[PDB]
Write a protein that binds this ligand. Structure first.
Ligand code: 0RO
Length: 466
């Protein structure tokens, strides 16, 4: 049931009309997640999924959008009988949250590619009966709001989504799947994951959204991809404009990833009179420091990626060292594979490529090169120190001999007279990991002893018998 006041801006004929609808909704006591997700999904469908007939912008008529809204509300209200789940204190019960989750779940097509683009919004849920993992969580939160359950909110880590609810918003419930081939814990709390200090649950320093942050989530969720080679400029512009709206209203304050996404967009196409990408990456880091105990990994990866693309080797290594300094106080657990993949790619592909080019440019006479800077060698060492410390105490190991080949190569990119300048104290650098402490003498030697490095990084007990 859309209110008269919600309907007055239709039809939406442009990017800017969509921005106005968002502004209007964000100025209400409770922005309407269902309306907003349906609108975003409609426009994304007609700008990215099917552009046949497109001449400027896919006009969103009130009759179309209101009928989609009706389909959603009718589906939820008919399947979830609230009288069966008495609410005291204006708060929801775990049984009610589970029932809403089941309703969304049981609505989805039995089989589909769960990784596909453009299956994030309630437009996809209604028209395609498909949602991606975090899409299911969002749709549970949208359904709860539709039912009047003001206490149910989206919880987000850097790789997963669930809900919070209940007295003081203190309860957690799983409502969707995570990854592939994992067993789901739907209906359960996230306490076991928090207690094991996995990255997936951020030691409890995950995001607890209010309604405005849930709008920011749907905006981050917009996917401009038309195919592998092509983005919709219209959706990029829309996402960028909506992110700025949210930024100006204060609603990205506690949302590091959204700041990084806005920085990435500003790199591609800067908005005149706005902060530089670097300023925005730093605001993302500051957000993580202020609200989340500096326990997030991606704020530093966003920054490192920016410096990497710009071939600022020194600053990229600094930011990846800072990324490792966060991961060192985690336990590498089952289901943390995404972050392992990210670190593996940085160590074993991205850094090698950067240093290879740097070596060529040094041969060509570069001055101020990262390869002649002992502070950059220290950053490389701190990056490996955090990865080795991560591994300590973890229930599954991180390092192996594939990593050792690249470490030897990367060390070897720095001359001994540069490496010798780093002072490893118990540029000055302190190691936290036992692996790097035992490697200290090997690191500053004129010739790099590759076999001894390999043995130290992988703690291999023995060398070839015969
Ligand atoms: C999927 C549920 C967890 C979330 C991921 C995410 C998100 N991402 C945006 C894309 N991401 C990154 N892009 C570049 C990166 C530095 C590798 S991290 C991290 C994940 N953005 C905004 N909100 C959320 S909530």
């Amino acid at each position: 049931g859309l209110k008269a006041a919600q309907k007055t801006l239709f039809p939406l004929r442009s990017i800017d009309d969509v921005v106005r609808l968002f502004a209007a909704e964000l100025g209400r006591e409770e922005p309407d997640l269902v309306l907003l997700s349906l609108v975003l999904g409609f426009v994304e469908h007609f700008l990215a999924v099917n552009r046949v007939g497109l001449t400027y912008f896919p006009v969103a008529d009130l009759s179309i959008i209101a009928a989609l809204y009706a389909r959603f509300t009718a589906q939820i209200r008919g399947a979830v009988d609230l009288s069966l789940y008495p609410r005291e204190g204006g708060v929801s019960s775990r049984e009610l949250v589970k029932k809403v989750s089941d309703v969304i779940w049981n609505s989805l097509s039995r089989s589909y590619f769960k990784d596909r683009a453009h299956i994030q919004s309630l437009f996809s849920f209604i028209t395609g009966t498909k949602l991606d993992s975090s899409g299911v969580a969002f749709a549970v939160v949208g359904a709860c709001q539709a039912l009047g359950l003001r206490d149910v909110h989206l919880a987000l880590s850097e790789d997963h989504a669930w809900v919070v609810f209940g007295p003081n918003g203190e309860q957690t419930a799983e409502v969707t799947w995570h990854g592939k081939g994992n067993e789901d814990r739907r209906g359960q709390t996230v306490n076991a994951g928090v207690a094991e200090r996995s990255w997936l649950y951020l030691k409890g320093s995950y995001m607890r959204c209010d309604r405005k942050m849930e709008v920011a989530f749907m905006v981050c969720a917009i996917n401009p991809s038309i195919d592998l080679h092509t983005d919709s400029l219209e959706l990029l512009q829309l996402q960028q404009k909506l992110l700025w709206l949210l930024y100006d209203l204060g609603h990205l304050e506690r949302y590091p990833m959204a700041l990084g996404n806005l920085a990435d967009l500003e790199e591609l196409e800067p908005t005149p009179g706005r902060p530089d990408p670097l300023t925005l990456y730093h605001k993302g880091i500051a957000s993580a420091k202020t609200y989340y105990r500096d326990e997030h990994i991606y704020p530093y990866m966003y920054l490192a990626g920016y410096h990497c693309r710009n071939r600022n080797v020194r600053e990229a290594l600094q930011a990846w060292a800072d990324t490792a300094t966060v991961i060192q106080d985690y336990n590498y657990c089952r289901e943390d594979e995404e972050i392992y993949k990210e670190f593996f790619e940085v160590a074993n592909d991205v850094i090698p490529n950067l240093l290879k080019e740097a070596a060529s440019l040094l041969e060509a006479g570069s001055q101020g090169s990262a390869l002649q800077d002992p502070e950059c060698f220290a950053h490389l060492l701190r990056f490996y120190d955090g990865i080795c410390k991560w591994e300590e105490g973890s229930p599954t190991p991180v390092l192996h001999v594939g990593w050792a080949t690249f470490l030897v190569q990367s060390l070897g990119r720095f001359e001994g007279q540069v490496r010798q300048k780093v002072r490893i104290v118990s540029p000055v650098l302190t190691f936290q990991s036992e692996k790097m402490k035992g490697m200290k003498e090997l690191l500053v030697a004129t010739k790099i002893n590759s076999s001894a490095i390999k043995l130290q990084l992988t703690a291999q007990s023995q060398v070839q018998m015969k």
